[PDB]
Amino acid sequence: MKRAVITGLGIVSSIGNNQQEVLASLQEGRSGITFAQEFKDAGMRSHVWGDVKLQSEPKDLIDRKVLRFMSDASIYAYLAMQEAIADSGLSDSQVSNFRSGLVVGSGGGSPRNQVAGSDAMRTPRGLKGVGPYMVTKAMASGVSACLATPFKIKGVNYSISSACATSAHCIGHALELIQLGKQDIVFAGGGEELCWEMACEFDAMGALSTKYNDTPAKASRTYDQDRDGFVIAGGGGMVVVEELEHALARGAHIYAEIVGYGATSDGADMVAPSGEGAVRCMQMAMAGVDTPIDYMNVHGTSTPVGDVKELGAIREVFGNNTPAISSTKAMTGHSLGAAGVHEAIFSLLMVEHGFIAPSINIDNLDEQAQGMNIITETTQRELTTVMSNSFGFGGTNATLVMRKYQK
């Protein structure tokens, strides 16, 4: 059946606002984590975040007619999509085409705008204080709605949401649409705002790191024995998924082919992973792939329970004969809705540039990871096939396998 390739990428993250900045950070093993005064001021225990530091204010980067409908998740996704379109070399007639779609999601929509609106409604500002653009800022589908219009998308247009797996499921579904022969191009990705309004929910459940506020760059430390929760982050990412013959026909640059996609459910525990659903997810994505997995960008968020469940799943699939492993979250933080596309992009850059980004802050490796091929220093290596895992709350799992395209 039809094959899908990635021909363009765009990204706004805690370690870079475009692929050049991100590539440099990945090669340097640079942390994007910083102290979050906003969180301290809000009364939270976690005072660290993977913040997006844009070059200018959004009003100076995006047309006001487009910007008036957006929450930060949409701003990030939009900037990422502009980059991806430029990178892909697509013309307006290919971006706006009956066979070109958009599948982009957010894990949380926009609690900041939602709260701003509800606060205004409870003051004399009333309905005028809410404003007429709140629906696109606050609804769950905001990120797809805010992008479909400005780019004049004519194909599919919707959001997939699934916590940490959100944008991984978006990319996988783009593969499915290409496989079904329904679309030739699908812009897939996600966005996530960074705010105390949403972050406090995670802190209230004890999911966030709180013991490293004085040394922010050391807080996120996947697979380290002294990890104490993830570091919340924001951002956006977009990849241009394209049917193979269509990409070849126009002379597109092919980063990789999406050769595997797994999507499963744990059917147990509402907040932490069970490992068994993760095992099936990895196995499903590896089905039919006739090459070994050279590198894997783990889900590994730096939580005590979560990291261990994933390691157990990895051992069930590969024993100690694992692919090279690193958690980029140790550097970037957990960007929730944007995590899947961010990590797919980090993996594509490692493939394109022949290197493995280090898994930082591992002072003492968790015993469950002993024996595995954990990379802790930037390593040059020819990577052919890569895998990226995304296991979100509610027991939802996604795994993508990508491979260099053989001309």
Within positions 297 to 336, which residues make up the interface with K ion, using CB under 5 A? 297
Of the candidates 392, 112, 366, 88, the one whose C-alpha atom is nearest the C-alpha of residue 270 is: 392
CB of 107 to K ion, least distance (A): 15
CB of 214 to K ion, least distance (A): 28
How many residues interact with a second copy (rule CB under 8 A)?
Answer: 89
Asked if residues 284 and 264 have their Cβ atoms less than 8 Å apart, the reply is yes
Query: Does 201 participate in binding a second copy (rule CB under 8 A)?
Result: yes
Query: Does 396 participate in binding K ion (rule CB under 5 A)?
Result: no
Asked if residues 309 and 278 have their Cβ atoms less than 8 Å apart, the reply is yes
Asked if residues 297 and 328 have their Cβ atoms less than 8 Å apart, the reply is yes
Q: Binders of K ion among 260-299, rule CB under 5 A? A: 297
235: left (phi over 0), alpha (psi -120 to 50) or beta: left
Query: Does 140 participate in binding a second copy (rule CB under 8 A)?
Result: yes
CB of 299 to K ion, least distance (A): 5
- Among residues 20, 37, 55, 118, the one that binds a second copy under rule CB under 8 A: 118
How many residues interact with K ion (rule CB under 5 A)?
Answer: 4
Q: Binders of a second copy among 343-402, rule CB under 8 A? A: 392-397
Question: What does the block give as tokens for 276?
Answer: 């068994």
Query: Does 260 participate in binding a second copy (rule CB under 8 A)?
Result: no
Q: Where are the alpha helices (DSSP H) in 184-333?
A: 196-204, 244-250, 276-286, 304-318, 329-332
Query: Does 343 participate in binding K ion (rule CB under 5 A)?
Result: yes
Query: Does 86 participate in binding a second copy (rule CB under 8 A)?
Result: no
Closest CB to a second copy among residues 96, 378: 96
358: left (phi over 0), alpha (psi -120 to 50) or beta: beta
Query: Does 340 participate in binding a second copy (rule CB under 8 A)?
Result: no
CB of 318 to a second copy, least distance (A): 21
Find the part of the chain contacting a second copy (CB under 8 A) among 75-83, 155-163, 240-248, 291-299: 155-163
Asked if residues 356 and 377 have their Cβ atoms less than 8 Å apart, the reply is no
Any residues with CB less than 8 A from the CB of 246 and at least 6 apart, and which?
Answer: 184, 185
Asked if residues 357 and 26 have their Cβ atoms less than 8 Å apart, the reply is yes
- Among residues 106, 209, 220, 301, the one that binds a second copy under rule CB under 8 A: 106
CB of 273 to a second copy, least distance (A): 12
- Among residues 22, 62, 134, 240, the one that binds a second copy under rule CB under 8 A: 134
343 interacts with, out of K ion, a second copy, none, CB within 5 to 8 A per kind: K ion
Closest CB to a second copy among residues 236, 337: 337
Query: Does 206 participate in binding a second copy (rule CB under 8 A)?
Result: yes
CB of 165 to a second copy, least distance (A): 7
Distances in Å between the Cα of 120 and the Cα atoms of 68, 129, 134 are: 17, 5, 12
Asked if residues 242 and 5 have their Cβ atoms less than 8 Å apart, the reply is yes
Any residues with CB less than 8 A from the CB of 82 and at least 6 apart, and which?
Answer: 10
User: Residues with catalytic annotation?
Assistant: 164, 299, 334
Of the candidates 294, 361, 356, 311, the one whose C-alpha atom is nearest the C-alpha of residue 332 is: 361
Query: Does 114 participate in binding a second copy (rule CB under 8 A)?
Result: yes
Closest CB to K ion among residues 34, 297: 297
Binding residues for K ion (CB under 5 A): 297, 343, 388-389
